[PDB]
Enzyme design. Sequence first.
Site, short mmCIF file in Angstrom:
data_model
loop_
_atom_site.label_atom_id
_atom_site.label_comp_id
_atom_site.label_asym_id
_atom_site.label_seq_id
_atom_site.Cartn_x
_atom_site.Cartn_y
_atom_site.Cartn_z
N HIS A 152 56.25 36.08 45.35
CA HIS A 152 55.97 36.39 46.77
C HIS A 152 57.21 36.54 47.63
O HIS A 152 57.18 37.25 48.64
CB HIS A 152 54.96 35.40 47.38
N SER A 180 55.78 42.42 44.81
CA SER A 180 55.67 43.08 43.53
C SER A 180 56.61 44.27 43.42
O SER A 180 56.98 44.87 44.43
CB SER A 180 54.22 43.52 43.31
N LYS A 193 40.25 46.00 42.79
CA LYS A 193 40.89 46.45 41.55
C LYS A 193 41.02 45.33 40.53
O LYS A 193 41.02 45.59 39.31
CB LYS A 193 42.26 47.08 41.83
N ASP A 194 41.15 44.08 41.01
CA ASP A 194 41.20 42.91 40.13
C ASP A 194 39.81 42.47 39.67
O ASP A 194 39.67 41.91 38.57
CB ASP A 194 42.00 41.74 40.75
N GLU A 233 46.74 33.57 13.28
CA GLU A 233 45.99 34.55 14.09
C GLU A 233 47.01 35.63 14.52
O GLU A 233 48.22 35.35 14.64
CB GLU A 233 45.37 33.89 15.34
#
Lengths: 52, 52, 160, 75, 48, 105, 378, 61
Positions: free
Chosen positions: G200, G204, G226-227, G270
């Site tokens: 922050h 971004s 969008k999230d 895995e």
Amino acid sequence: LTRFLGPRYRQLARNWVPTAQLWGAVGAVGLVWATDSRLILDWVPYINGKFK
Amino acid sequence: LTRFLGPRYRQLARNWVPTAQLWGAVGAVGLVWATDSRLILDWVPYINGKFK
Amino acid sequence: GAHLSSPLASIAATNKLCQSFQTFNICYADTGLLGAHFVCDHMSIDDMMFVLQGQWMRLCTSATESEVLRGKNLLRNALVSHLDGTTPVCEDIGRSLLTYGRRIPLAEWESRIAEVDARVVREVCSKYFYDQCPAVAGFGPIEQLPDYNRIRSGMFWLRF
Amino acid sequence: GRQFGHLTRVRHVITYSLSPFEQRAFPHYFSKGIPNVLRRTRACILRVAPPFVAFYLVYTWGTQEFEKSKRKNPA
Amino acid sequence: AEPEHDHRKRMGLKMLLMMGLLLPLVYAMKRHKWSVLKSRKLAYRPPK
Amino acid sequence: VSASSRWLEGIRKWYYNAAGFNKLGLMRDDTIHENDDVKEAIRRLPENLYDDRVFRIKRALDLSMRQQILPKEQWTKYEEDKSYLEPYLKEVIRERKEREEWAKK
Amino acid sequence: TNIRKSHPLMKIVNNAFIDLPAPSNISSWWNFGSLLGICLILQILTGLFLAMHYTSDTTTAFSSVTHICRDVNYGWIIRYMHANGASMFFICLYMHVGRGLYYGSYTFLETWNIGVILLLTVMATAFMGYVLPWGQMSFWGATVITNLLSAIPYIGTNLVEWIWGGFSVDKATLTRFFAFHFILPFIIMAIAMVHLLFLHETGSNNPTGISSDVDKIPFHPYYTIKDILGALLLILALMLLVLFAPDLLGDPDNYTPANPLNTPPHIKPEWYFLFAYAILRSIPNKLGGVLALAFSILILALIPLLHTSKQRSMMFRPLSQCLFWALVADLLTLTWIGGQPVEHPYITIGQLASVLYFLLILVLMPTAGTIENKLLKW
Amino acid sequence: VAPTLTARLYSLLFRRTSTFALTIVVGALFFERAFDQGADAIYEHINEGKLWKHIKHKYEN
Ligand code: HEM
Ligand code: HEM
Ligand SMILES: CO/C=C(/C(=O)OC)c1ccccc1Oc1cc(Oc2ccccc2C#N)ncn1
């Protein structure tokens, strides 16, 4: 990199060298005492008392 | 306490009463649907299908 | 200052939220623009939008008898103070004949003003303001001016 | 952290926008869309694909050579 | 080894049938809100 | 001046086109990473260059978002890619290097 | 006044999720940050409901897991949700890191470095989590990995036997691995909070690597919706696995109880550890193995110091774009080799891919960036 | 149909956030009955006879 290469910085290193040496001693004796590192502690007179 | 007692506040209550009634309906039908509260759901026609 | 009747005006003075605002009801044939204009500091646009939009919404859902009488009184005063001397009245004669077809007498305006209770205000406000798409015009240091979607969101209340 | 009104200096830029209720969500979804995806595939296939095609060959050969190594025709 | 078999295939169908209804719907919600930016037009008007 | 120096220039024009910032209407100097020397050079730009820079960045971020590119004619031509930041950035580094030579003695 | 701004709690929520200035142009590749948060929460909520029924002793460690899937009301749904959620978490970690590398997001020194710590911590969690069922792979994976710490000079054997609580992966090891598996995700969440604190500060980055200050949009509603769509896609992928292919990404040996006397034919992780498992067996030395193994992840911390380009992003960088995809394909090669035996073609191409991984990050990509600069006369 | 089905749905039920929530809640109840059973009915057809609900009449008392 090349910016830290000069007469002042050599002086600045020489000024902090005894200090950085003594912090190494603090770190070492600190590590030796905290782990009970027998290899080093076998040499010191009063701390020697750990007869197998 | 005594400050909220007046003509404007009676108007303000009357203004928000249908809204506060409808949120009660949202809460009730919401609770009834989420728990599958059989006591109330035995009355509704299509949801009735849970023959013991 | 802080003692002003209007909530938007009072909060705006107290918190120094603008240099000015004004409401308007711009009229055209079968259409028009209804809302507010304001001039404020770069950091104060968001609060100003919020406080104004919240006022439209307060009035749309929860208008009260007393404040509506004040609005009626300001209007009676606005209408009478405006029609003072030959230039305002002559203007009112020319314009009214083009827009209404007749001259609407002051007694009739009063009659139509007197009719407006709180129930009228919130019904009529809802018809035009509640959950509608605004036209937004912005000029100057407008980085803090809300995104259209957020302005659109302030046109309804989730509580109502 | 920075907020709006404190980000940067911008001068003389007009942005025209429409309400989402006045405009359609999918304007020309397939008519404009399909040409666009093909365009940006074409713009990148020479950078994305040649390492994967190289892995595919190193995978296909490697698997083949693993099987034909234990078996022997003479004693 | 897998007693749940029948039940997981059942809810799996419900998963697919729900997602087939929900995926385009949430897409349309996002596409609606984003249309404000997608159709936005820029003009640069520097002085004389 | 030379046949092979025209070839270095044609390979450079190739890379320029492959980089593809011109497809978003950008100039080379628009695309620079913003460090301290760079920030200062932007700061030192005249009004007209800063305003154009802002718009070109604005336009390209808009295109980036809508996943579009400009029409072919509107791409920044390699020949006319004006290196507006060059003398400013060179002067900022010049000034830094002096300060650093001074901080050495 | 707007209470979103004034109120001390809501202030944070507003500054983090609502009024945060976000770039207009951020890809679906920016979605994984939120998806990782969903995955960490999903793992906490499924993990807890498993812990309400799971037993931490070697006796009924395997039986409790069985009891969950067989007897516990919808216990099978929670169990495969947790096991596939762990893989989901790993597909996301990888996209996220790759995005960071491609787009130059690593230049956010602290954010990225906290993310390196975040990756190691999720890895350490999953490794310990796998031991819990006490299957054949659970035990044999544990013995094959912990025994590496023996190769450290002088300190070595003492460390392994301290982590072990004895002389092998035993009763005590299963119990302590549960304790550490329970605490770690909370310590992860707290570090993930500090991660976001540092993010922050700058806001971004975006696909161009140019500043987005001139074209910032509020997080709500653009990145809220969008999230939501992105999370609906992650639930689709997770629920495709849990409800159609619950045994696809897992190893069958984990369905037989642990047996310290019988080693399985294959010893494979895995998918999410296969690339690193390959690097380890590729180098014949014991200590060199672990030192290449630690350097396999710890290398990401060097990546910012190996940035050479005048531009931030790879968007306008074709030489770097090819060498990037080479890294992804090379890691996919290492993934393939990890799940394969140590015989003829696989030993060579395994160590070939291993040397390439380190050459590509340390030497190859820092050279391409320099050449790309020369081509732009920069 | 004179004003649109969507137009009359907004006027009556989508204007107020109260009735919007109520329509979602009432619509969630009625959807759950039509879906759960409807998807179960589809599950019957792809597994005709295979299920215990089809076998049931074989072992009675
Ligand atoms: C515990 C798993 C993690 C979580 C929950 C997490 C959380 C997030 C979030 C929410 C964002 C902002 C949205 C976005 O840009 O994606 C982000 C961005 C970022 N993260 Fe992470 N992250 C984690 C793993 C990582 C790792 C492993 C690294 C590096 C090894 C990393 C370094 C970064 C960087 C550099 C960004 C900035 C991206 C940008 O905005 O350009 N994170 N993180
Ligand atoms: C950082 C997030 C987490 C990750 C990556 C993670 C990873 C894993 C993995 C890989 C397994 C083995 C999968 C299997 O064979 O089924 C597992 C199982 C387990 N986890 Fe977690 N987990 C996390 C969160 C937690 C938390 C918070 C708890 C405690 C509330 C927990 C408790 C358990 C238990 C009891 C098991 C054993 C039961 C079982 O195998 O299904 N997990 N976890
Ligand atoms: C207890 O074994 C757990 C395993 C697991 O969770 O695999 C996904 C596992 C199973 C079989 C074989 C080995 C296993 O463990 C591991 C652990 C492991 O740890 C790392 C992962 C990434 C980078 C470095 C290391 C190390 N050291 N790298 C490879 N395999």
